[PDB]
Amino acid sequence: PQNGSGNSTSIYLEPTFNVPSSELYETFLDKQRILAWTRSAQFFNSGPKLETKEKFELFGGNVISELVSCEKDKKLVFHWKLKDWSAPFNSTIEMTFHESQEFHETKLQVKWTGIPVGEEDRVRANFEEYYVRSIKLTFGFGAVL
């Protein structure tokens, strides 16, 4: 046995946001809106919004993300990786939108794969704080108590 790393695991979250799929989709792409709920973002391109195959650092540079595929208010797939993570470890998070016009809500089905075994509970609790509750309190897309 040689010195290496562990395996990978997966999670599945579904936070409910009170915002149409058109406005919520632009929240994860508009750089002017990203700085609102993140309070710190570093973009390398001069584009107004995020594009395909574009890397950008979040939360002081500790969170490295990259948009690899996205649909019109339907799909959002990002390559999520942490600063303290190793080189082979690189997770990919998928965001699927489901607009419910009867209740005026949007259940964002989040299919996150490629998370390390030991780093599972860390990226799940902080996702509800830096991504779920941060947007609900900045843009008013949900009641938090």
């Binding site: 009170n18 009867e102 209740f103 005026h104 008013g140 009641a143 108590l145």
Partner: protein, 609 residues
Amino acid sequence: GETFEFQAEITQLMSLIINTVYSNKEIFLRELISNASDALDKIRYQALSDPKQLETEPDLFIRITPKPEEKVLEIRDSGIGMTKAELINNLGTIAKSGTKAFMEALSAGADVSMIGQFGVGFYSLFLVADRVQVISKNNEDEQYIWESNAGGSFTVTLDEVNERIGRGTVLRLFLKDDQLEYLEEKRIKEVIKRHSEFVAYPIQLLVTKEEVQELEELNKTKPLWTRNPSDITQEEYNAFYKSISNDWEDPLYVKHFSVEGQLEFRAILFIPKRAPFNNIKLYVRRVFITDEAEDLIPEWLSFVKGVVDSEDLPLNLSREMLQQNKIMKVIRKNIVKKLIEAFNEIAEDSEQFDKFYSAFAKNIKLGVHEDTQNRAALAKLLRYNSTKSVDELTSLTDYVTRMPEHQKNIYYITGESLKAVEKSPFLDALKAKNFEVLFLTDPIDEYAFTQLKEFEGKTLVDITKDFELEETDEEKAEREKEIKEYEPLTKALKDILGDQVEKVVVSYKLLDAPAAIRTGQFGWSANMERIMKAQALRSKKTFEISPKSPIIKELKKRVDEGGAQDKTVKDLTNLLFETALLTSGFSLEEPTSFASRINRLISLGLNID
């Protein structure tokens, strides 16, 4: 391979039970009182088969006589007692429980529930005493003395110098110099009230008054969970509630149930009359274990009082905490299920539910926001005012009963008080169509309605936000013709306000008010935005005008005459916009500018140049 056996280092194991466990030092009184109750149960079980055993000392009691002159805390009971051999085996061997050995030798279906199962509870008195003098007396033996200095050896001497007792055991606790607090009446009654308050046998305390000494029964209120809820009267429940909790008032409702099977446990849950703003204590073998259980009661249901007396709970060596066993969740769902059934029984009464809902309105609505499994059951208890219920409160099920056949949504409105929502201009639209609108006055109402989202198929719709109503074929063509006519007026109000509003549209849901502001059915309401901006521990607007108001008609006349950029039309636009914010529930930014506009209208009315 040689097969050895496990040994035990007495000089070190004795210290492991003396100054390494029992984090708190008042535990010595509870375990000694519990040891007296087990001895009283042994002689009581033998009295049913042999009355001669209870003829020496027929009165069963537990006497505590503090002596501050010689620093001796004497605890005397009239139990079965210990012989000369029991003082060496049952009281001289670590982890040897003679009480557990007596329970395993009983018959099938016994009514006695003793406490002693571990066998190391007697060595807890050394926390406050340097040496103990145990005086025992059995029916089939003589009276002996068990002396030890918490070391590695003890002596057993025949009692020939102390007072002769009939039957039982006398424990003389020579308290240390630093543990002299247990010789006063305050600390003695404090540990008993906390730990051994519900002992079946009376606990007598020798109290000196100002040198006439008397005996007071510390446990005045007998436990009620060992009795059927049928023969328990009302005044017994009131006295029991004032003992488990320090409340002075009587309990509003009592929910006494019993679950049988593989998890037999008793629980008497009390609902107070006023909010206490844990509360549910845990009891095992008539002994208080702890009350810091967080998974036993939900956070929104933490207002209920009472105790839970279970029997199958894995206790640690200190009997002050519970180990993880995936069983508290079963008791958790049973408590909520019985309390929800209890809340439904209170709803059957009118005078009883009025006091319960008015005192715990925040707690009931908090469960709708937090709990999800029983969210529909808690919605049945929600009571609010409405246009047809301005006098009393009505439920959600009564709302659907009065809904016409052409209504498909439950309409409500949020605000700061009842007087603000009863005069809101958003009610004139629904009152014309005979639509009942609920009134939400508490800040927690919006948090509950944003999680239910549906009641019996009816979608909860807030009239404060943007919504749509039904309209005939004759009106859909007239409204479209009037909206396109007022199109330049909507654009005239947009560039004046600018970023203050999202869009200016002509709305027909207004009859008396000339203008109003809505949220947009996706953002935070006017009340929700005001709530978040006022919490100590912690949206776009739509300008809609009424085309039938005479003020709006006059503003429309100024547009076609080239008055889209006049000074007087800009003053009235900002005045009417900020006025609608006060009616819709919004807060005015820089209220000094709004007051300066009103002062100028006052001068115009008073003929001031």
